[PDB]
Symmetry: D2
Subunit: 299 residues, 4 copies
């Protein structure tokens, strides 16, 4: 059954069992849901109410523009013509950009700086706990993620409607995350997040004040396939969550990722610079003919 982990229990006598759940989650699920994670409910509830406030502003503004755009063509804009989807990204590390993102309150910007510093601390704690389970030095993964300027840490803030009906959302393509460790905060209890475990869809159980954690492709490389990045997809439920803060703690652009030499005995995962993996992901690496001829010879 799905790993739900009370993170505070790692401080007390039930540490061995809690670290075991994390080990089990990392090896067999690629995902776990955290509660009692050292981020107050007051802080999370602030983030929710404020983000929903910003969203409400954007939709009232968007409708005024739609009515004007549509009226230009001699057509009445209905409320049913609304694009309810809104998403924007907030970079934190190595260079923050919360001061430069358009159309935010100063008190909103300040709470997201507070939210980001809290999350990188949680992210870095979890990586240390992983380091311990793997039998590795403290801060090995933080070190490996660093590169020169430091690790890439940012947050995708999204607000969205429910899906019109399930059968449309069926047959949609899933993915594994290319990054390092990914921390999802949502409103409600129902995430609408599904894992593809043994050919079948398992829903992430609903939990209030939770943070859902999962491991990306980079940690699979570093652990030499031991902690695998798992196939998944998020879908908006009819009476579930309609707000998602997805914070990605990835390696820095120039960080050289490779399997930790300790975790290699008797195939071997590759060595590469993180930006090149992301450049492959975005289709930039085969923009000339000679590379394409290499690739077609390999196949």
């Amino acid at each position: 059954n799905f790993p739900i982990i009370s993170l505070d229990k790692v401080n007390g006598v039930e540490r061995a069992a809690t670290m075991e759940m994390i080990k089990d989650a990392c090896e067999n699920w690629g995902f776990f849901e955290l509660v009692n994670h050292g981020i107050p409910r007051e802080v999370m509830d602030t983030v929710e109410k404020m983000t929903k406030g910003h969203y409400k502003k954007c939709m009232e503004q968007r409708f005024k523009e739609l009515v004007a755009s549509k009226a230009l063509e001699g057509v009445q804009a209905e409320v049913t013509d609304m694009d309810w989807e809104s998403t924007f990204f907030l970079k934190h590390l190595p260079i923050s950009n919360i001061s430069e993102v358009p159309d935010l309150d100063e008190e909103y910007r300040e709470v997201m700086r507070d939210f980001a510093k809290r999350l990188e601390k949680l992210a870095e704690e979890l990586l240390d706990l992983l380091c311990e389970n793997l039998g590795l030095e403290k801060g090995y993964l933080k070190n490996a993620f660093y590169g020169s300027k430091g690790p890439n840490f940012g947050t995708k803030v999204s607000n969205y409607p429910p899906c019109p009906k399930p059968d449309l959302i069926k047959g949609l393509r899933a993915h594994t995350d290319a990054g390092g460790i990914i921390l999802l905060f949502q409103d409600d209890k129902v995430s609408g997040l599904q894992l593809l475990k043994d050919g079948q869809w398992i829903d992430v159980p609903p939990m209030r004040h939770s943070i859902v954690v999962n491991l990306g492709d980079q940690l699979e490389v570093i652990t030499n396939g031991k902690y695998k990045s798992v196939m998944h997809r998020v879908i908006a439920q009819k009476d579930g969550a309609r707000m998602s803060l997805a914070s990605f703690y990835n390696p820095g652009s120039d960080a050289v990722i490779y399997p930790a030499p300790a975790l290699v005995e008797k195939q071997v995962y590759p060595k590469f610079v993180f930006d090149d993996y992301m450049k492959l992901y975005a289709g930039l690496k085969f923009q000339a003919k000679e590379p394409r001829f290499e690739a077609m010879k390999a196949m």
Copy 2:
């Protein structure tokens, strides 16, 4: 209570009462819901299933493009990033364009030609019934709508998600329709359509296999304010309709609209060409300075 009108009863002994409901609806509601309207359930159910099929194709295509667009920026497209709103228009009269609209099946195009001819016949029947209640010649409104080339008749086909939550949709601007007579076919029974009667929102009652009819600004002019066009808005409900075919039967561009001289005794509504009203609606009429100076002198 809201006028629900069985149109077949106009053929039988209960005609007087049915015409009375239409008169009451036209004068005090500006809206009525038709059942038994001479369009088979089989024909409507075909239109629904086929349109939803086309919509499903567009969303699977749209997601493939989104995943590719987002991957270009080194970002994973989630299903929650989907724009579920899709809308396109089908002109019928005076010049049909169902053959030229991109990405439709031939069997779909053919059903919409069949659907359009059925609706203009219903539209023109209703106008005659209105002519009778007003004490006017048969086909007076059809005549008045004609102009030179004939009346404008088309259909807005829309598919959309539910609204994330009510409080966002609250405070949204309502309208009266600028056109002639407007016929709304929907799936489900719940329209999500609201009238603004005496300062308060009244929902259009849910009815299966119904066509909701309402009168636009042009009929108010022609009736000299007797049949007023009513304030309204449509909002997508959480478990209501998610498909809307809104067919507008408006006057032709060059049609001269004015109050029928019979309906004038002891202020008088204006005379104008329909295209000029629509050019005013779209803000094209005050594109030069001299017109603006006229308007500011009037205020």
Copy 3:
């Protein structure tokens, strides 16, 4: 012949003749070209080189994105597929926004603050010179433009290619400017700006280090038709200017514009709040039915 005015000559013995040219320009041309205007060539040449630098960055960035967008569809982006047009606005008064506009250098932002303060001083000087020619109190127009928070002052920065060929640009719609006083700085000497004087197109003569000034609709109201806002259009020449900084000094949103009572003897121009004129200009004023019925009755 077109009014070219050396502004420094207003300090010396040739003031009467220079003020006469301004009077003539304001009454019979609606336009004049300033030289020796109290903005150093060094300051203007800085603005040019820096803005062209920012533009070059945007086009290299835009092409990288186009190549990626087009490659997504299995198509090679040619250089001939480039959208060379780029335009952005910089608000100065009442609230500056040069700090918040994306993708600018700090040294660029700082020069535009310096450029803006210089131009509002020039703008306000010219309005005083107009006040003198009209026989009005010093700062009357600045006062009238103020409202509550102060006048609207901003700058449209544009970079663009030449027009493919003249015959495409022929038959294009001209305008008068809705605002107050409009100050155009360009690179090159050839503006590509044309006036519509007595039914015929007159080119603004080419002059290096010039600022082209023209009067908008608001000054025509305030002068009771004496200083008329003139029809014009700007067109990119094959070997002329390819950069335009158009700074608009308009009245504040809440400023009540009306003909100065001194300038009224034996029709009278209207009184209105500036925002309402701009709301009429944008087609927002006839978004409901009752207003439209007023307008159609007037016609």
Copy 4:
């Protein structure tokens, strides 16, 4: 010096020398310019005048929309705000779509059907001439391009302004064409097309009534590197061409491309299905993690 080839001379006594020029062009230039190519000047001049007519319609329409869009925001659209770039594609083989492309005259559609049939005949002639020079069977390349349904043949029609200045266009990325054989028809004599021969830019010489031909990546594979696809880019000149019809004759999606076994003695170019090469080109092939791990191991 650049290969300019009179194609009619292949019928007469000067055939050996003309075929030698084609061999030289194919081996050392990857490009040649055809004259007297069996497409009348009357037919080409029709294509030019008609396409420019369609373009003029689109720009007058685009400006009307821009003026309305910009006026919505309380801003005057200048002619200098125009996006002059317009481009659309016309599929011919295996399935024509000239009947379905929006906003074309019937007489325009018909001329493009006539133009397409002429070009595929020219394309297939040239491939036979190449087959002869390579020492291959007649129609070997046409056969190899076929797959199941037949070869992909279409035409990119583009209209565009000149580049604002050269130094912006400098440092822009060049390419080789991924397709088969590519035939460029232009107005004017100046193409603005440049080859990257021995590290340096060579302009394609200006010639009236010419068709510029070049070889893509697929022909390099089939010839086992003998006929190489050459680096190039097209740039709009200040007083050169402003219209480009680029017709691509590529292999069919399912066509298996590989080096002709005759042309292999003592590295070997790869075998692949054409769609997979184009799927690699568009970045779709590394959308999952396992493929990316293969690619990073190879590097």
